[PDB]
Design a protein around this ligand. Structure first.
Ligand SMILES: Cc1cc2c3c(c1C)C(C)(C)CC=[N+]3c1c([nH]c(=O)[nH]c1=O)N2C[C@H](O)[C@H](O)[C@H](O)COP(=O)(O)O
Ligand SMILES: Cc1cc2c3c(c1C)C(C)(C)CC=[N+]3c1c([nH]c(=O)[nH]c1=O)N2C[C@H](O)[C@H](O)[C@H](O)COP(=O)(O)O
Ligand SMILES: [K+]
Ligand SMILES: [K+]
Ligand SMILES: [K+]
Ligand SMILES: [K+]
Ligand SMILES: [Mn+2]
Ligand SMILES: [Mn+2]
Lengths: 500, 500
C-alpha cells in the first residue's frame, strides 16, 4: 500500500529515506521515549522508532515519535510532511498547503467499506485489556496522566448520520477502561458532542484510531469546514476512495490499515480529571488539572506488531507547529479569498509559536480597492477572527508582495519595520480566544475572549500608487550584472551545498 | 600598538584571526566594494580589505568593509567586536556590553596630547584635494550621494570647551570641499550644534576622523550621557589615556593613529541635499532627498597607505545592528538600574531589526515591589522612552529570569506566548520617535512622535508568588539523570562541534 494511505508503509518510507532511527534495545515509556523524541524535535533529527518499549505485551505496542517533524536539511525540510501526501520530499510549504486545500473545490470521494483489514489482526474485549497496563507514555515529567492520544484520530458522527468527523484532540488514560481529554468549542468533536447532548438519549458512539493513513491524519489536523466529512475530503485530495472497516462494537468505520483502534463512547454526562499537559506553546502548568470529557473503551483491535505514533510536543519544532499552524494558515488563506480579500499566501511563523499568521497581499488588487489600513484591517480581522479557522491565531500580520510569508526572518523584518505599534493595528476583544496560549488561560484577562490583533505591515503607498522603496540588501541594492560578477568571483577572491 | 588602540593594528588582528580577505585586484568603489561587503554581512563571512580600490591616488585610500559585523561560528560570533576592546574573541555579548558600561562608574582618564602621529604622515591643503576625485563609495544603487562617512567619528566641542563629543552620524560628499549629513535631535552632534547656533557667532569647529582606535569607535556608537567626553570614557574603559594630536587648522584633537582626518567646520546656517541612504532598518526610498547639515572641509591629513573603514549597512547583519542596537541596549540596562528598576540584562534582538529591546527582570525583586503590570510597564516606558538612550527603540519587551535576552529565539517565544496583545501592553504616543524606521518617517503618523510600546511578557504570578510553569522542552521536562542518559546514548542509539 502507498505511504500516504497506510501508516505501516509510511514508516518504511521514512526508513528508506534515511529519516528513521530504529531503537531495538529497551526504552522506557515513562519519559525516556518522549525525551528522545523531544531531543529529535529540537534538533530536527531522524524520527525514532522504538521497537522494544518496556511494558509492550502481546503486540501492544511499539512507538514512532516525531512523525510530522522537521528534517535538518533545507532542501527536504518538510519531507515528513510530503511523505504524508505522496509529494516529493523536496516539496515546498506552498505545495504542501496547496495539496491540503485542493479537495476544497472537488467533489468528495466517499470511502469504500471493506470486510476486513490489518486493524482486525488482533482484538481484546472488555475482559482482556487494561489501559493502565499498556506502555502508554508519560510525555512530560509534570503531565497529569499518560497521554495515549497525541497522534490518533477521533471518529464521531452527527446523530443524523450525515457528518462523520475525524480530528486530533489530546487524551490521557483515566483508568483501566476510560480516557479523559479535551473536547472544547469550537472544535468539531465538541460541535458533534453538543448535538448528542441536546438529543439527550445516549453517549456518543466513538472510535479512536492510531496509525491511520498519513493523508487522513493531515486532514484530521486541518480545520476544514463544518459538516464536511474528512474521509471524503481525503479521498478527493488523494484521488482514491479510502478503505474503511466497521468497528466490531459500533457502526463507525475506521481505516482498514489502522495500527490500533479503540471503540467505545464519549459521555454526554461524565467528566474526569484531565491535564495538565505540555502543549504546543511550550508550557506546562503543574498541578493545573481541570475536568475534561470522559471516554469509555469497550474494545481494542490492532495490527500484528502495532505501532503507536506519538507527538512529544512543546517548544519548537513538532507536529503542533508544522501541522496545526500551517494547516490553519492554509484554511485561513482560502477563507480570505472566498471573502474577496486579496490574499495570495498564509503561513503561521514558527518564531511566533504558531500564534501569528502572516497574510501576503496582492497589492495590485489592494490598490484597486481604494481603501485604507484601518478599514482593511478591520475587514480581514472580522473575516478570520469570527471563523473557526482563526481560533488558534491571535495576531494576523498583513504584508505586501515582496515578503515570502513562509520565511519567518522576512515576516519578522516586515512586522518590525512596517507596522507602527498601536496606530497600524486593530485589537479585537469580542472574538473567541484560544485559552491554551499562556497569556489567555493563565493571563490577565478573560481566558476565552479577546486578545487578538491585526497588525498591518503594508506601507502607505501600497494602498495607493505602489511600493516606494527598495531593500538595502544584496538582491535589491545592486544591479544584476554586478551581483553575478560578485557571485562568480566569490571563491576566487577568498570567501566561502544546496542538498547538505 | 594594541588592536583596540590603533586601527592599523586592528586590521592585522583580523588577518591574524583568519577573519580578513585581502583583495589585491582592482575593485570599483562605485557599488562593487559595497556589494561584496553586503554579501559578507548577509552571510557572516570574513571582513574584506580592498587594497586596490579604482580611483586610489597618492595614498587615498584602501577600504575595510564589515569592521563590526558577525563571524559565522557561534563560538566567536562577536569576535570582531571583542577585537575592538582587547577582549578574548570568544567573549559573550554580556561581556562586551559590560566592558562598554564599565567606565560609567569610573573616573574619566583624560586624553594625552602628543606632538605628532601617523595621521600626520601626509597632508592636503585646501588647493590640493577634491572630495569628488577620491574613491568614495557608492554604497547602495539608489543612494543620493557617495557616503564617505559610515564608520568615522565626528568630533565637535561645546562653545565653553567643557564637552568634546565623539559620534558616528552618516555623511556624503556634496562637492569638492563639502559634505552633507544628518545632524538630528536628540543626538549629541545636534545638541552641540544648537549651542553654537544660539551663540550665533561662528560655524562649529569640526573634525572627522576615520580609522580611529577601535575602542573609540565603539564609544562613538554608544549613547553615553550628555556632557560626557567620550575620550575620557574610553580612557577609563581601556585603562589608558588616549593619545591625541591637534588638528592643523583648528584646535580640536584627533587620535594620533587616525587613518584619515578631515578638518573644517559644521555650518550653523547652511544646508544641502542629503540622502536618501540605505540605512539600518533595511530600506532606501529612492529620490527621498531632504536638506541636511553641511560641512566644509579645509584640510585632509592621512597615514601612508590609509585605510577607510566602511559599513555597507542594511538588512541583517552589520554594524548598525551589532553596535547601534547592542550599545543602546547596554545604556538602557544601566538607565533602568539607576532608576531603581529590577533589570538585569538588555539586548536589541536582531530579529526586530534592533527596534525592540528585551529587558530581563529580576523577578524576586519585582515581587517585593508589590506592583502590577500596568503600573510597572508605565514606569519602565517613562524611564526609557523619555531618555535619549531610548531614542532608537520602539518596543520594550519585559521578560522574566528564565529568558536569555541575548537569544532572539527565546525572546520571540516569550513575547509570543506571555504578552496578550493590547491588554498586556502600554502605548506611548507623546515621546520622541525615531523617524528613520519606515513606519515612522514613511508611515501613517507623525514622523517624530509616538509609535512606542511596552509589551509585558511577564506572567501574572511573576508579580506575586513566582513562576508557576515549567517549559515543555528537553531541559525542563525531564529529570537530570534521564537527560544525561539520553545525551550519553545519543550517537550509540543512531542520532547526530562547539568551535566549528
Ligand atoms: C497535530 C495536532 C493537532 C492538535 C493537537 C495535537 C496535535 C499533534 C496534540 C494532541 C499533540 C496536542 C493537542 N492537540 C489538540 C488539538 N485540538 C484540540 O481541540 N485539542 C487538542 O488537544 N489539535 C488541533 C486540531 O487537530 C485541529 O484544530 C483540527 O482542526 C481539529 O479538527 P476539526 O476541524 O475537525 O475539529
Ligand atoms: C555604528 C553606527 C552608528 C550610527 C550610524 C551608522 C553606524 C555604522 C551609519 C553611519 C552606517 C548609519 C547611520 N548612523 C547614524 C547614527 N546616528 C545618527 O544620528 N545618524 C546616523 O546617520 N548612528 C548612531 C549613533 O552613532 C549613536 O546613536 C550614538 O549614540 C551617537 O553618539 P552620541 O550619543 O554622542 O550622540
Ligand atoms: K479535521
Ligand atoms: K503599516
Ligand atoms: K557617543
Ligand atoms: K503578560
Ligand atoms: Mn472537521
Ligand atoms: Mn556623546
Amino acid at each position: 500500500q502507498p505511504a500516504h494511505l497506510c501508516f505501516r508503509s509510511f514508516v518504511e518510507a521514512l526508513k528508506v529515506d534515511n529519516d528513521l532511527v530504529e531503537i531495538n534495545t529497551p526504552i522506557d515509556p515513562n519519559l525516556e521515549a518522549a525525551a528522545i523524541t523531544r531531543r529529535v524535535c529540537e534538533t530536527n533529527d531522524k524520527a525514532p522508532l522504538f521497537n522494544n518499549l518496556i511494558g509492550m505485551k502481546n503486540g501492544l505496542f511499539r512507538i514512532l515519535g516525531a512523525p510530522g517533524s522537521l528534517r535538518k536539511s533545507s532542501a527536504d525540510r518538510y519531507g515528513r510532511l510530503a511523505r504524508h501526501l505522496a509529494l516529493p520530499p523536496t516539496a515546498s510549504m506552498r505545495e504542501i498547503l496547496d495539496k491540503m486545500l485542493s479537495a476544497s473545490d472537488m467533489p468528495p470521494i466517499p470511502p469504500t467499506i471493506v470486510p476486513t483489514g490489518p486493524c482486525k489482526e488482533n482484538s481484546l474485549d472488555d475482559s482482556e485489556f487494561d489501559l493502565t497496563e499498556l506502555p502508554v507514555p508519560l510525555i512530560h515529567k509534570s503531565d497529569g496522566g499518560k497521554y495515549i492520544q497525541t497522534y490518533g484520530m477521533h471518529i464521531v458522527q452527527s446523530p443524523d448520520g450525515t457528518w462523520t468527523n475525524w480530528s486530533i484532540a489530546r487524551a490521557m488514560v483515566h483508568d483501566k477502561n476510560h480516557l479523559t481529554g479535551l473536547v472544547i468549542p469550537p472544535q468539531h468533536i465538541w460541535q458533534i458532542h453538543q448535538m448528542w447532548k441536546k438529543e439527550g438519549r445516549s453517549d456518543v458512539p466513538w472510535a479512536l484510531a492510531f496509525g491511520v493513513p498519513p493523508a487522513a491524519i493531515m486532514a484530521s489536523s486541518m480545520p476544514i469546514p463544518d459538516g464536511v466529512t474528512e474521509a471524503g475530503y481525503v479521498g478527493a485530495m488523494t484521488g482514491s476512495s479510502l478503505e474503511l472497516v466497521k468497528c466490531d462494537t459500533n457502526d463507525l468505520y475506521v481505516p482498514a490499515t489502522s495500527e490500533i483502534v479503540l471503540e467505545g463512547t464519549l459521555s454526554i454526562s461524565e467528566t474526569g480529571p484531565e491535564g495538565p499537559f505540555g502543549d504546543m506553546h511550550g508550557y506546562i502548568f503543574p498541578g493545573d488539572t481541570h475536568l475534561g470529557a470522559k471516554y469509555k473503551v469497550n474494545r481494542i483491535t490492532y495490527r500484528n506488531n502495532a505501532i503507536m505514533p506519538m507527538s512529544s510536543c512543546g517548544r519548537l519544532t513538532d507536529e503542533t507547529h508544522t501541522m496545526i499552524g500551517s494547516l490553519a494558515a492554509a484554511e485561513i488563506r482560502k477563507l480570505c479569498q472566498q471573502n474577496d480579500l486579496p490574499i495570495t499566501d498564509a503561513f503561521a511563523p514558527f518564531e511566533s509559536q504558531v500564534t501569528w499568521v502572516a497574510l501576503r497581499v496582492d497589492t495590485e488588487k489592494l490598490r484597486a480597492m481604494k481603501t485604507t489600513s484601518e478599514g482593511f484591517r478591520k475587514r480581514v480581522g472580522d473575516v478570520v477572527f469570527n471563523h473557526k479557522a482563526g481560533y488558534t491565531i491571535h495576531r494576523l500580520v498583513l504584508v505586501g508582495d515582496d515578503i515570502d510569508v513562509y520565511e519567518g526572518k522576512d515576516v519578522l523584518w516586515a512586522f518590525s519595520t512596517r507596522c507602527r505599534p498601536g496606530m497600524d493595528e486593530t485589537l479585537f476583544e469580542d472574538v473567541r480566544g484560544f485559552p491554551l496560549i499562556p497569556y489567555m488561560g493563565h493571563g490577565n484577562g478573560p481566558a476565552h475572549r479577546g486578545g487578538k490583533v491585526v497588525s498591518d505591515a503594508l506601507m502607505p503607498t501600497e494602498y495607493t500608487t505602489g511600493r516606494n522603496w527598495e531593500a538595502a540588501d544584496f538582491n535589491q541594492s545592486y544591479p544584476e550584472d554586478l551581483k553575478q560578477k560578485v557571485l562568480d568571483n566569490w571563491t576566487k577572491m577568498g570567501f566561502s551545498h544546496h542538498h547538505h
